[PDB]
Design a protein around this ligand. Structure first.
Ligand code: FES
Ligand code: MG
Lengths: 135, 215, 99, 220, 57, 103, 96
């Protein structure tokens, strides 16, 4: 039958080699499908090694420009009464509305961070947003 | 029926048990092969020697490596490996050179289908480690077609008997690479002192190149 | 016309929320054994909270409740452990039914 | 029989997407089903690094762009195997979804194994079941990890027995020995339900297309 | 294996590859070179590679 | 396989007809109790273990000729037990969603 | 390319480190009250950092200041100055 050395090559490589060598009398049902539509990576066994030196995982952190605005908003006001409806994909939190107002006001032309923050707060208060400052 | 089975080691192993004192068993290393590349090895533990033979030879055929042979008679390139404390140095050899290798390696190569190869074993000569390292190195060897596909260049063979005739033994499957490749003035390759000593003639071992029976 | 995955990740409510620490979310009790409410709140993992003594009978499957998240996934490496060990559940404090 | 075997078996291999599985899902659908969510960055497994878009507040996010291609390949392979009247065995030691998965199998005319995996169900199937038993032609892992967070022994056993394996790999999984890994969340109920629905639809579509092709050939 | 970087240098086959055989007039050759600096890099490699062969020939 | 069982069933029917003929009974109403009584009379064995006495009477295989098993939980190796557990768990789910002299 | 690609920057949500109570404040051997705030009322023993909750630098500074005050006649060695028993209890010790 087929070779059981799972750590030597892949199932496709072992099966093809055995069929070519004539050990396997007939190709398995999946061999033609694998040949037609191979996966992106050949399932060759690989032993995982832990990094030791200057090498580090290339998984970059996810950050956006609005992250600073969100951090400032959470520092000044906190979570707020409006709870997060994470089930709704289109849900917009109070922090999200503050970020949108900050972005549009910055697009208007204002550049100072403190001025943008205070104008956004006043605009949201006018709009009917309960921006209860914590400090 | 196309597979041949060969014994490589039969060891009597004893254990200290309170119930029976010294318990005796047989561990057998068995290599099987069809003489066409497909070969494997297995270990059988049993109280009876014939049972150990049966177990090992029936288990080996489920662990068959496929060894690629250049021109169906030799390895594709020299293989230097160190499995545990056993160094194996295999040299690709032309047709008719025979099997000048350790007797276990001679048997395993006969099972695989290799007819011409050189093999030197250094360090520990443990039979199990020797067999495992030999199979690892033979399975991990790179064929000419794989090299041509990897580097996108024609693999051309130069033979002294054929003069300056270039023999294109491999060609890339995909588009060919127009890079003329680096003309490396000096190859940074880790040579082996024994090979250099033999090439320069400084080696004068009274056991090398001894006339031996056909292998 | 389909937006790229980066746009969806950037505009997703989960990304809009910063660190989960003490954020207010709305969850749905999707399982009850005896007194342990298994509530999903849109994260990768659920949260298990003991049934409060006040209006305990009012907490049933499908009830919408308010949670204050403390960790989207409770993980902690241990001495000699190669990778962080996880309990496959989030940590939230159940406040009460959301209406 | 060659005029039959060729026309029914080999013909679907001439098409990039014979069963049109790419219409069954979209990146938006996977995003809604929380497929992209992963474990903490500490729990990250090395071989899952290429499939990770990034880390968001120490939480790994799975790149749905790669997930789309991997899921397309896996669904196409599963549909082709089902079309060839192969045996498909779903495996998941996640108790929470166990029942559901079993139902899906029973509804798609395929086989499930969510309970404890006894030692040797694949490597010793000739002795456990019988010398003439037929091992599965494809194994689908809805969860590649056992209850002690180690990889399922079924993965290694199927690799030993040369059985192709589709698998949903989270950030802490080991996609090395999986033939068609699909990087995605395996803990959220929405993600698991989406995977079950997708595989059920692929298998049912493949079986009905096989019936249609066989009937059309008979009417030829 | 043979010790050192580029052990091929310590072989008769590589030493005999030198194609420079000085005329009988040449008696002394001084090689002033800098261990650092890209402009002298080739010179360094020369000292690393061709000084043996030349001295062999 | 099922072919062997069917052959045994046909052989048992033919032998039942012969037994009814030998005893003079009606081959139609010649039931299992009549078969047992006739066998006990014709082959009187006094072995105490009733399983060892002569008897004329009427496990299976879980996959067809194509190799596909009939039960979707076959590969568990305990398909009957796990199917029963699955049904019980489904009934418990339904009950949860909707809401002596026996041992 | 696309603006939705994440940008490389430091954590804005990162909270500040939990600065010790004596951080940024000069510790002096003449401040017998502050030094007495970190010694056992009954035995005069200098509390460890697991009790005072101080960093290594401030723990070392407090220890050196206490030793200097004790050797220079500013602070009792075998106990706590009774006039400083009413000070706020910053140590995480519970005798009863
Ligand atoms: S906390 Fe700042 S000096 Fe210790
Ligand atoms: Mg997971």
């Amino acid at each position: 039958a087929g070779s059981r050395l799972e750590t030597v090559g892949s199932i496709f490589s072992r099966t093809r080699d055995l069929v070519r060598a004539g050990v396997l009398k007939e190709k398995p049902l999946w061999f033609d499908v694998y040949d037609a539509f191979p996966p992106l990576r050949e399932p060759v066994f690989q032993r995982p090694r832990v990094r030791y030196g200057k090498a580090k995982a290339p998984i970059q952190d996810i950050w956006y420009h609005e992250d600073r605005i969100r951090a400032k908003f959470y520092s000044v006001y906190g979570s707020g009464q409006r709870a997060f409806d994470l089930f709704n994909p289109n849900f917009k939190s109070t922090c999200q509305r503050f970020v949108e107002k900050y972005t549009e006001l910055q697009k208007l032309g204002e550049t100072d961070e403190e001025k943008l923050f205070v104008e956004t707060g006043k605009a949201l208060l006018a709009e009917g947003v309960i921006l209860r400052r914590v400090g | 029926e196309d597979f041949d089975t060969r014994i490589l080691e039969v060891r009597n192993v004893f254990t200290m048990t309170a119930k029976e004192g010294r318990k005796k068993s047989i561990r057998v290393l068995v290599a099987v092969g069809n003489g066409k590349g497909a070969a494997g090895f297995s270990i059988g533990k049993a109280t009876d020697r014939m049972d150990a033979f049966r177990k090992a030879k029936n288990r080996a055929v489920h662990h068959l490596h496929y060894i690629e042979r250049y021109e169906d008679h030799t390895i594709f390139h020299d293989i230097s490996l160190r499995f545990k404390r056993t160094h194996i140095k295999m040299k690709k050899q032309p047709k008719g050179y025979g099997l000048r290798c350790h007797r276990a390696i001679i048997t395993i190569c006969r099972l695989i289908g290799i007819k011409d190869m050189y093999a030197k074993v250094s360090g520990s000569i443990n039979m199990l480690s020797l067999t495992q390292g030999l199979f690892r190195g033979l399975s991990r060897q790179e064929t000419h077609q794989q090299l041509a596909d990897k580097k996108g260049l024609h693999v051309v063979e130069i033979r002294e008997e054929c003069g300056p005739l270039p023999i294109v033994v491999a060609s890339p499957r995909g588009p060919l690479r127009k890079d003329p490749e680096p003309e490396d003035e000096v190859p940074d390759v880790k040579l082996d002192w024994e090979d250099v000593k033999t090439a320069q003639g400084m080696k004068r071992s009274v056991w090398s190149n001894l006339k031996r029976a056909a292998t | 016309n389909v937006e790229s995955f980066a746009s969806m990740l950037r505009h997703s409510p989960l990304t809009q929320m910063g660190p989960a620490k003490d954020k207010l979310v709305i969850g749905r009790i999707f399982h009850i054994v005896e007194n342990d409410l298994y509530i999903d709140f849109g994260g990768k993992f659920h949260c298990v909270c003991r049934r409060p003594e006040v209006d305990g009978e009012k907490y049933q499957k499908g009830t919408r409740v308010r949670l204050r998240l403390l960790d989207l996934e409770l993980t902690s490496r241990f001495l000699g452990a190669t990778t962080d060990t996880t309990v496959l559940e989030a940590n939230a404090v159940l406040l009460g039914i959301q209406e | 029989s060659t005029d039959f075997n060729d026309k029914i078996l080999n013909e679907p291999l001439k098409h990039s997407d014979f069963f049109n599985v790419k219409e069954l899902f979209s990146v938006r659908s996977l995003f809604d089903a929380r497929v992209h969510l992963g474990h903490k960055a500490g729990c990250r497994h090395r071989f899952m690094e290429p499939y990770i878009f990034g880390s968001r507040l120490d939480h790994d996010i799975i790149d749905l762009e790669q997930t789309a291609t991997h899921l397309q390949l896996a669904l196409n392979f599963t549909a082709h195997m089902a079309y060839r009247k192969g045996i498909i065995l779903f495996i998941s030691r996640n108790r929470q979804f166990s029942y559901l998965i079993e139902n899906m199998a029973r509804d798609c005319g395929e086989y499930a194994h969510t309970r404890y995996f006894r030692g040797g169900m694949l490597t010793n199937a000739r002795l456990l079941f019988g010398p003439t038993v037929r091992l599965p032609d494809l194994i689908i892992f809805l969860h590649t990890l056992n209850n002690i967070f180690e990889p399922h022994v079924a993965v290694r056993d199927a690799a030993k027995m040369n059985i192709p394996t589709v698998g949903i790999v989270d950030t802490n999984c080991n996609p090395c020995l999986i033939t068609y890994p699909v990087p995605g969340n395996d803990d959220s109920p929405l993600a698991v339900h989406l995977y079950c629905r997708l595989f059920q639809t692929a298998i049912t579509r493949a079986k009905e297309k096989r019936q249609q092709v066989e009937a059309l050939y008979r009417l030829q | 294996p043979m010790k050192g970087r580029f052990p091929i240098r310590r072989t008769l086959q590589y030493l005999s590859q030198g194609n420079v055989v000085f005329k009988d007039s040449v008696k002394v050759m001084t090689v002033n070179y800098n261990t650092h600096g890209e402009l002298g890099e080739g010179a360094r490699k020369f000292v690393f590679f061709n000084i043996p062969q030349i001295q062999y020939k | 396989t099922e072919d062997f069982i069917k052959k045994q069933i046909e052989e048992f029917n033919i032998g039942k007809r012969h037994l009814a003929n030998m005893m003079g009974e009606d081959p139609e109403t010649f039931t299992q109790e009549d078969i047992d009584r006739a066998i006990a009379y014709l082959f009187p064995s006094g072995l105490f273990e009733k399983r060892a006495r002569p008897v004329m009477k009427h496990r299976a295989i879980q996959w067809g000729e194509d190799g596909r098993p009939f039960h979707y939980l076959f590969y568990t190796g305990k398909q009957s037990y796990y199917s029963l557990m699955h049904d019980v768990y489904g009934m418990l789910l339904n009950l949860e969603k909707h809401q002596i002299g026996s041992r | 390319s696309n603006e939705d690609l994440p940008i490389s920057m430091e954590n804005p949500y990162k909270e500040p480190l939990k600065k010790c109570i004596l951080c940024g404040k000069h510790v002096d051997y003449k401040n017998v009250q502050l030094l007495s705030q970190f010694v056992s009322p009954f035995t005069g023993c200098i509390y460890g950092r697991h009790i005072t909750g101080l960093c290594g630098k401030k723990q070392k500074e407090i220890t050196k200041a206490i030793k200097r005050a004790q050797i220079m006649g500013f602070m009792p060695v075998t106990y706590k100055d009774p006039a400083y028993l009413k000070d706020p209890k910053v140590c995480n010790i519970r005798y009863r």
